[PDB]
């Protein structure tokens, strides 16, 4: 089965697209090498299409069925409810794509009669019709990167707004509750960054001779077959569900999740999908279950001992008991052979690691710093190149997602988020007096509206108070950061230390919540430190979800 079939009609933009870095008066203070930053556009869509279009073969053995039976047994203990129209409506993001049938995200949120009526008719159609393929729109994502001495745009596929509300009605409570029950500690979404760090370190230490590896499948969404999506549905249907929910789930699976026609922004037929849609509600849960299933079965084929898996979407890490260097390397080949038979070959072959910090997953690795007392603190960091390129773009242009804000929240303990992102953007916010203005950002693919003034509390709850006093970062983390700055022509860290004193002083001067940001976020910048005391899960990744 081919992942996609194409008609030849182009994938078209729905608005003007910028590829070149926009520049303003603030741009040079962050980043000088402007021509290294770019954004992807629909002009590279043709290139992506070629990468994501291929034949899938699948060979399923007893290890696969055994694991599947175990997953279903756990799924059978889950009781999920239908959300009402109103509940599903409130989960709809304010700036989500409008319907073709005369209403938008804000009409849905307000329970407008036109929106509510169309949702009711869409739902009724899902109950009464389990065969007719549902239309989808295919777009090129506009995303910002540094040149990798260019990436073609990713493709997003999603159905109409009315359908997206109905998905939430049928399945939101399922995708929010089921994966944790089925996968236990392996379900990565449940942890805050601080809990995840703690889980990883405790898992590494739980093995006598630890070995770990990342496995990243090439173009995972395209590797998802009709069988995979049907198997996912069979898992959902194990739950204790309302009869209405069962029918809607069967309907959505047959008509939408397994595949359907692809329409561009201008309304022309682009082709046909027989793989995972990126923009449906079940994408995150589905990829996580399917990755868990294939990898768990692949662990058994390779005879890996005392495995602990961590899975988040298509990202996978296994930590297990080492059987020896040679024995480990051999068993990974078998793992990859098993995964390939299940349709999920790797982009890069997996490498066994005997140090936790050398494992990268979701672009992140563990590193170590020290708190005020000098005790070791583990935290998750990443290469700051992409965060910094995106920050430079957002310095000059207002975007749908404020990646700088998400990056500060998710990587708050990092050397680069604290010294560069906090310092740069708080200076900008101060200059415009927009500290209290709530901004859209994404945490684990879930959309939130957050005021910068609330960052101290948000950081404390996600990382603990230690995130405001970490020092003595590792030479390797420091060198990676300093090397990235030279590469992009970002000023060196010593300049940011100077700038943070000013920004701290400016924040302290305004009193109130502003001064609290000065005290906690910038305590790293003063030599005479101020004692930091206390300041005063949800289950929806990707697939168009918002919370107040």
Ligand X SMILES: CNC(=O)c1c(-c2ccc(F)cc2)oc2cc(N(Cc3ccc(B(O)O)c(F)c3)S(C)(=O)=O)c(C3CC3)cc12
- Which residues define the annotated binding site for Mg(2+)? 216, 314-315
Name which position in 150, 471, 498, 547 contacts ligand X (CB under 6 A).
471
Please give the Cα distance from 258 to 488 (Å, whole number).
43
Rounded least distance, CB 529 to ligand X, Å: 8
Can residue 365 be called a binding residue for ligand X (CB under 6 A)? yes
By beta-carbon proximity to ligand X, the closer residue of 81 and 487 is 487
Can residue 413 be called a binding residue for ligand X (CB under 6 A)? no
Q: Which residues have C-beta within 8 Å of that of residue 360, sequence separation ≥ 6?
A: 214
Binding mask 480-499 for ligand X (x = CB under 6 A): ------------xxx--x--
Q: Which of residues 193-222 bind ligand X (CB under 6 A)?
A: 193, 196, 200, 212
Determine phi and psi for 472, rounding to 5 degrees.
50, 55
3-state percent helix, strand, coil for the chain, nearest multiple of 5:
50, 15, 35
Nearest Cα to Cα of residue 544 among 286, 281, 177:
281
Can residue 522 be called a binding residue for ligand X (CB under 6 A)? no
Can residue 285 be called a binding residue for ligand X (CB under 6 A)? no
Can residue 296 be called a binding residue for ligand X (CB under 6 A)? no
Can residue 452 be called a binding residue for ligand X (CB under 6 A)? no
Q: Which residues have C-beta within 8 Å of that of residue 252, sequence separation ≥ 6?
A: 126, 166, 167, 170, 171, 282
**Residue 195: enclosing H or E segment and its boundaries?**
helix 193-205
Window contacting ligand X (CB under 6 A); options: 102-110, 132-140, 390-398, 524-532 = 524-532
Q: Which residues pair with 2 in a beta bridge?
A: 55
Rounded least distance, CB 177 to ligand X, Å: 18
Rounded least distance, CB 171 to ligand X, Å: 19
Q: Which residues have C-beta within 8 Å of that of residue 298, sequence separation ≥ 6?
A: 63, 335, 336, 338, 339, 342
Structure tokens at 489: 């022509």
b or e along 180-201 (b: 16 or more beta carbons within 10 Å of the residue's beta carbon)?
Answer: bebbeebbbbbbbbbebbebbe
Name which position in 60, 323, 478, 515 contacts ligand X (CB under 6 A).
478
Can residue 103 be called a binding residue for ligand X (CB under 6 A)? no
Q: Which of residues 305-364 bind ligand X (CB under 6 A)?
A: 310-312, 315-317, 359, 361-364
With beta carbons less than 8 A apart as the criterion, state whether 397 and 410 touch: no
> CA of 132: how far to CAs of 16, 120, 168, 261, in Å?
34, 18, 20, 11
Can residue 69 be called a binding residue for ligand X (CB under 6 A)? no
Binding mask 431-450 for ligand X (x = CB under 6 A): -------------xx-----
Annotated binding site: 216, 314-315
Summarize as ranges the residues that interact with ligand X (CB under 6 A): 188, 193, 196, 200, 212, 310-312, 315-317, 359, 361-366, 380, 410-411, 415, 444-445, 471-473, 478, 492-494, 497, 524-527
């Amino acid at each position: 089965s081919m992942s996609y079939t194409w008609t030849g009609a182009l994938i078209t933009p729905c608005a003007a697209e910028e590829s070149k870095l926009p520049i303003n008066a603030l741009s040079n203070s962050l980043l000088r090498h402007h021509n290294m930053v770019y954004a992807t556009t629909s002009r590279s869509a043709g290139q992506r299409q070629k990468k994501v279009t291929f034949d899938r073969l699948q060979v399923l053995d007893d290890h696969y069925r055994d694991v599947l039976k175990e997953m279903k047994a756990k799924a059978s203990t889950v009781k999920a409810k239908l959300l009402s129209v109103e509940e599903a409506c409130k989960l709809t993001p304010p700036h989500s794509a409008k319907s073709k049938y005369g209403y938008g995200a804000k009409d849905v949120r307000n329970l407008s009669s036109r929106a509510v009526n169309h949702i009711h008719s869409v739902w009724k159609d899902l109950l009464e019709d389990t065969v007719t393929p549902i239309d989808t729109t295919i777009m090129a994502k506009n995303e910002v990167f540094c040149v990798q001495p260019r990436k073609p745009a990713r493709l997003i596929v999603f159905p109409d707004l009315g359908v997206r509300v109905c998905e939430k009605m049928a399945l939101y409570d399922v995708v929010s509750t089921l994966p944790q029950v089925v996968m236990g500690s392996s379900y990565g979404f449940q942890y805050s960054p601080g809990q995840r760090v703690e889980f990883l370190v405790n898992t590494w230490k739980s093995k006598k001779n630890p070995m770990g590896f990342s496995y990243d499948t090439r173009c995972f969404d395209s590797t998802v077959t009709e069988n995979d999506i049907r198997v996912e549905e069979s898992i959902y249907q194990c739950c204790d569900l309302a009869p209405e929910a069962r029918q809607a789930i069967k309907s959505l699976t047959e008509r939408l999740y397994i595949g359907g026609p692809l329409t561009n922004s201008k309304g022309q037929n682009c082709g046909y999908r027989r793989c995972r849609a990126s923009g449906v509600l079940t994408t995150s849960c589905g990829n996580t279950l399917t990755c868990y299933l294939k990898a768990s079965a692949a662990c058994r084929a390779a005879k890996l001992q005392d495995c602990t898996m961590l899975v988040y979407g298509d990202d996978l890490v296994v930590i297990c008991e080492s059987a020896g260097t040679q024995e480990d390397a051999a068993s990974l080949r078998v793992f990859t052979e098993a995964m390939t038979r299940y349709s999920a070959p790797p982009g890069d072959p997996p490498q066994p690691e005997y140090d936790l910090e050398l494992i990268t997953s979701c672009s992140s690795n563990v590193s170590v710093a020290h708190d005020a007392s000098g005790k070791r603190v583990y935290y998750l960091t990443r290469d700051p190149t992409t965060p910094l390129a995106r920050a430079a773009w957002e310095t000059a242009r207002h975007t749908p997602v404020n990646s700088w804000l998400g990056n500060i929240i998710m990587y708050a303990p990092t050397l680069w988020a604290r010294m560069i992102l906090m310092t740069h953007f708080f200076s900008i916010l101060l200059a415009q007096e927009q500290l209290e203005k709530a901004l859209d950002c994404q945490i684990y693919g879930a959309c939130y509206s957050i005021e910068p003034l609330d960052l101290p509390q948000i950081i404390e709850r996600l990382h603990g108070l230690s995130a405001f006093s970490l020092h003595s970062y590792s030479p390797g983390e420091i060198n990676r950061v300093a090397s990235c700055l030279r590469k992009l022509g970002v000023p060196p860290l010593r300049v940011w230390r100077h700038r943070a004193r000013s920004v701290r002083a400016r924040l302290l001067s305004q009193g109130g919540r502003a001064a609290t940001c000065g005290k906690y976020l910038f305590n790293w910048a003063v030599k005479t430190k101020l004692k930091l005391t206390p300041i005063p899960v949800a289950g929806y990744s990707g697939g168009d979800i918002y919370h107040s």
